[PDB]
Design a protein around this ligand. Structure first.
Ligand SMILES: *[B@@](*)([O])C1=[C][C]=C(C(F)(F)F)S1
Ligand SMILES: *[B@](*)([O])C1=[C][C]=C(C(F)(F)F)S1
Ligand SMILES: [Mg+2]
Lengths: 277, 277
């Protein structure tokens, strides 16, 4: 049971309980207003407690996707947009400046609400802010944040792909090709996005999907199985050997490895022309 | 320039090179058709080569969000939709059944095109498929895939959070609360996605966002800095101490820790009510 304010680019959802002057709670890391609901109950007889799901979280919905620069660590799009959400939320519920509390990164949003929309602010509270920009040692703390985020975003992935490599016995050539960075940064950032997506939304769902041997036998005359000449011993060739074992469907060898169609396009094509040309 | 076919919930983009019978190439992990163009160049005098950007990748775009259950590892929404795209693409490019080659996860899409839309297949080729469902050792390979993806998705995040709370001296009760797993498999998936979004899209961007001490001093009578009585020594209280030392803006102690509003709501309210009630 949530309220909705439609705004530029999002349906902003929020709880509202009580009577009197409006009191907006801005969540921190958890991003959602439910975490203030026991606090609201203790306040609903003095303030109209409004507790927001910030537009990227919870029951709030984006109506158009984030800009691609939002992943840049010095992008200001999201913090400024959250702060404008709170100001428009205030302006839609009150004709007076309102009370505001933010906690942790939510208190940083609160700082930007006061900076950019001081006319909506009656009183404001910053509960344990982690912003570092104005500290004498801002650099130390910014560098810690950057390096721990970098570790999280990269280490486990690198290890897991190598573990995939040994477990599946991927050929060296494929391994280097399949894990080579892009010459640009716009192409390099996309490639982490894409790999993360394949991992969460493709590999498990597709490799355990609803194909039976019976499906191949039904139309056996149509099917060729292809094994690369440079990827012998790898797990997908064993998939083809098993299909062939149980169905009789022929295996054709074709040049290159798992990526043979671009490792060796000429020889790849010569085989496809022999089969189908 | 690429070609476009508009389907339910997606605009599907694809390269088209050559003439002759239609030959559809379905990409695996990289998900885009460009990887087939050097091959397409070798076949263009024999086939109308069609190299697809599957709908979640490349120059294709969704026109509706993925279903929330698509992150479920047992989901078959994506593989079915991909298979249905290829069938629709074939039907839009030929009145005769066509030639189709899929590679790796793209060969799995090709298998579902055959199962569910055999009417569009003249011949089909499965290049190095990694599907395990029908293998006699299926449990082995399914559980390897599940474990390695899970490790990739969770391991470095669990380590980095632990490093974060220790660099920042987050209170034990707070670290306990902010890492506690959700109580459902579906709750944990969203918890993971939420934390992963916060790390990539919020922590660096907000904590180094453009706020200066003069932004506070300009409205000093409006502000209260709040420190939890149970999170002493933690980095955010250090931030508040600095703001206070430089601007004289008051620090008020409020019960609980970084999550005090939920940890002790009664005592948290009593302070707020002292402040603004
Ligand atoms: B409250 O959610 C936070 C306390 C420290 C934070 C950072 F990691 F940004 F330093 S966030
Ligand atoms: B081709 O891109 C693949 C070879 C092995 C794969 C899996 F990780 F699923 F086993 S995918
Ligand atoms: Mg604005």
């Amino acid at each position: 049971g949530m309220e909705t304010l439609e705004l530029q680019g999002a349906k902003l959802r929020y709880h509202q309980v009580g009577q009197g002057p409006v009191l907006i709670f801005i969540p921190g890391a958890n991003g959602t207003g439910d975490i203030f609901l026991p606090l609201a109950e203790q306040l609903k007889d003095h303030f109209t407690v409004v507790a927001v799901d910030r537009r990227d979280y919870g029951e709030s919905e984006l109506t158009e996707p984030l800009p691609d620069s939002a992943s840049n660590p010095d992008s200001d799009y999201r913090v400024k947009r959250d702060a404008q959400d709170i100001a428009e939320l205030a302006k839609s519920l009150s004709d007076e400046p309102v009370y505001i509390l933010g906690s942790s990164s939510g208190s940083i949003v609160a700082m930007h609400v006061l900076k950019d929309y001081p006319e909506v602010v009656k009183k404001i509270a910053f509960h344990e802010p982690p912003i570092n920009t104005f500290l004498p040692d801002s650099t130390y703390w910014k560098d810690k944040n950057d390096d721990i985020v970098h570790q999280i975003l990269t280490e486990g992935l690198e290890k897991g792909m190598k573990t995939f490599g040994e477990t599946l016995n991927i050929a060296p050539i494929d391994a280097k090709m399949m894990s080579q960075p892009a010459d640009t940064e716009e192409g390099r950032i996309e490639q982490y996005k894409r790999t993360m997506f394949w991992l969460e939304f493709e590999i498990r769902q597709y490799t355990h999907s609803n194909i039976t041997l019976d499906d191949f036998t039904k139309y056996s005359d149509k099917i060729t199985l292809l094994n690369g000449t440079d990827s012998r011993g790898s797990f997908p060739q064993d998939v083809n050997f098993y299909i062939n074992k149980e169905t009789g469907i022929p295996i054709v060898d074709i040049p290159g490895g798992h990526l043979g169609y671009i490792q060796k396009p000429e020889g790849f094509a010569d085989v496809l022309l022999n089969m189908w040309g």
